[PDB]
Structure 1
Amino acid sequence: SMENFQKVEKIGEGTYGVVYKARNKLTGEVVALKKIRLDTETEGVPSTAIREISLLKELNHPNIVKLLDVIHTENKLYLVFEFLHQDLKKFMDASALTGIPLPLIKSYLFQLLQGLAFCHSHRVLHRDLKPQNLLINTEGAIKLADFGLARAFGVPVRTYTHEVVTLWYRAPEILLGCKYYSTAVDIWSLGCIFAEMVTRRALFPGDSEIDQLFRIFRTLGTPDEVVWPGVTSMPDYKPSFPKWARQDFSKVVPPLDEDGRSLLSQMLHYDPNKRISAKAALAHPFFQDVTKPVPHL
């Protein structure tokens, strides 16, 4: 079954299973294998895996991690993935001194948006966009990965799991405990990621949910019924929130040009209904001159 795969090394552990780099002994292809243990006397195949596999089988796009195979045993599942050199978090950390070139940033955001638009066009929320789940290769590509927390949604959307998205990338609608969320929550994460690629520090690094909101408000201005209609009627909204003025994006992301700043603000709009779509974002003037440079690895 796995006779043709030679393990090379461990490369970490996602929301579920454990991930190895491997080599197809016959074809020479380098892959990542996700080993998922099957609870054969208790719970069977984890729902995490049922969603990841089923959604990735449908999602075939250059900016979405390619699932090559699923190899069954009675006791294990191995997902075979194309191998990508590393994740964006490791890349950022490696680029802590040198910085990331602006054209590469712009290229990556453009690709992330192409991948995401494809997801939304195919009725899938990702719900766990963070640098650790974005994979780069040596040729300048980037791809959405780890669809364990993903969900095929209907139109219109219904109530889904609230415990979603890593805190720092979590949209204010989820924080304030809203009944419904949609494609907008993914755009928020990418906004956070955009900013993080520019500064290589997380935009909103909270210690708690209340701390998370404070971080968002202090930088974008405390929202009101003018900016975000229905915000003050939100489940976990607190009349008592301090009222901060919006911080200029000159302070927030100094390196960023006027176009970048405009795109960023639209990505971090408080109102989910005004938050820009990935589709619209692809047209933004920021990407007029977009190229595909290769990273410095």
Structure 2
Amino acid sequence: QWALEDFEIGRPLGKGKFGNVYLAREKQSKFILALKVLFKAQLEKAGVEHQLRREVEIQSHLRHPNILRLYGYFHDATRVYLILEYAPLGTVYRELQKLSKFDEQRTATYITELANALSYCHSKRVIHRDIKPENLLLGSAGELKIADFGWSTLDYLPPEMIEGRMHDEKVDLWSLGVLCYEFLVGKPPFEANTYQETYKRISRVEFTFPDFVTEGARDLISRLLKHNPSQRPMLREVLEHPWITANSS
């Protein structure tokens, strides 16, 4: 179906580990989109051809406004290209750097938008690992969009994953706890100056709140960051959580 000659290439929109993403326009439709380039030799150097292949097959079937859409993909002699949804307003990480921290309305809105994306995924038996601000993009109306590779620094990993126990649907809820914290405070809850320490602090769920963090927020974050996965509240319970409904659009 596709080839590189079918597109005009624009400025870079981001740098991945295996290649860059560029703004691009499909020539006949004039459809604006994003295009991720991936080097094949570089892929085989780290042996992830069929880690990535299953990954692509998955998110083709995923359609949700709070998830970045994969329209299609193609290849050539040297590279592999992914056709992506263009997200005009950029990354949340960038927004959080400009603003230092987010207010409660913004935070609660993003959390709701995330929770809805994950509910959709879980309903289709798709689970997600750690979610970083770097991998959250913004659509044209300011809507949050999840963009990364999985889909089924430690700062975002839950205790069960770093301790080498059964990963599970409940990982997602840990991620919401960390993000909700980071949105309000401006840095993640178990940030340390060493990996060894960050590991240790995550395993103990050893973290504290700045004075300004309201008790509604404290409650939600404390409930999501429970060490026992099964004690973390359901996604429905998050969306219903008083502080969420009180602040979210």
The reply on whether 1:168 has 2:155 as its aligned counterpart is yes
* Aligned counterpart in structure 1 of residue 164 of structure 2, from 167, 177, 180: 177
* Aligned counterpart in structure 1 of residue 120 of structure 2, from 103, 118, 121: 118
With over 3 angstroms needed to count, the CA separation of the structure-2 counterparts of 1:100 and 1:28, relative to structure 1, is farther
The reply on whether 1:88 has 2:89 as its aligned counterpart is no
Q: Name the larger-Rg structure.
A: 1
* Aligned counterpart in structure 1 of residue 198 of structure 2, from 212, 219, 222: 212
SS class of match (2:73)? strand
Q: TM-score under structure 2 normalisation?
A: 0.86
Q: Distance between the aligned counterparts of 2:124 and 2:143, measured in 1? A: 21
Alignment of 1:9-20 (within 5 A): 9-20=11-22
Percent identity over the alignment? 30
The corresponding residue for 2:6 is 4
Q: Is the 8 A contact 2:154 2:199 kept in 1?
A: no
Alignment-mate amino acid for residue 123 of structure 1? R
Q: Deviation at 1:260?
A: 2.2
| CA-based RMSD | 2.5
Bigger helix share: 2
The reply on whether 1:54 has 2:47 as its aligned counterpart is no
The corresponding residue for 2:70 is 67
Q: Distance between the aligned counterparts of 1:255 and 1:6, measured in 2? A: 48
Q: Is the 8 A contact 2:33 2:84 kept in 1?
A: yes
Question: Alignment length, in residue pairs?
Answer: 243
Alignment of 1:17-166 (within 5 A): 17-39=19-41, 46-84=49-87, 85-96=89-100, 99-147=101-149, 149-151=150-152, 166=153
* Aligned counterpart in structure 2 of residue 202 of structure 1, from 185, 188, 193: 188
* Aligned counterpart in structure 2 of residue 283 of structure 1, from 232, 240, 248: 240
Q: Is the 8 A contact 2:239 2:245 kept in 1?
A: no
With over 3 angstroms needed to count, the CA separation of the structure-2 counterparts of 1:38 and 1:192, relative to structure 1, is same
Alignment-mate amino acid for residue 279 of structure 1? R
With over 3 angstroms needed to count, the CA separation of the structure-2 counterparts of 1:123 and 1:207, relative to structure 1, is farther
Q: Is the 8 A contact 1:105 1:197 kept in 2?
A: yes
SS class of match (2:230)? coil
SS class of match (1:195)? helix
TM-superposition CA deviations, 1:213-251 (whole Å, max 9, x none)? 44343735xxxxxxxxxxxxxxxxxxxxxxxxxx5xxxx
With over 3 angstroms needed to count, the CA separation of the structure-2 counterparts of 1:187 and 1:53, relative to structure 1, is same
SS class of match (1:168)? coil
SS class of match (1:126)? coil
Gaps of 5+ in 2: none
SS class of match (1:146)? coil
Q: Distance between the aligned counterparts of 1:268 and 1:218, measured in 2? A: 7
The corresponding residue for 1:261 is 218
Q: Deviation at 1:14?
A: 2.6
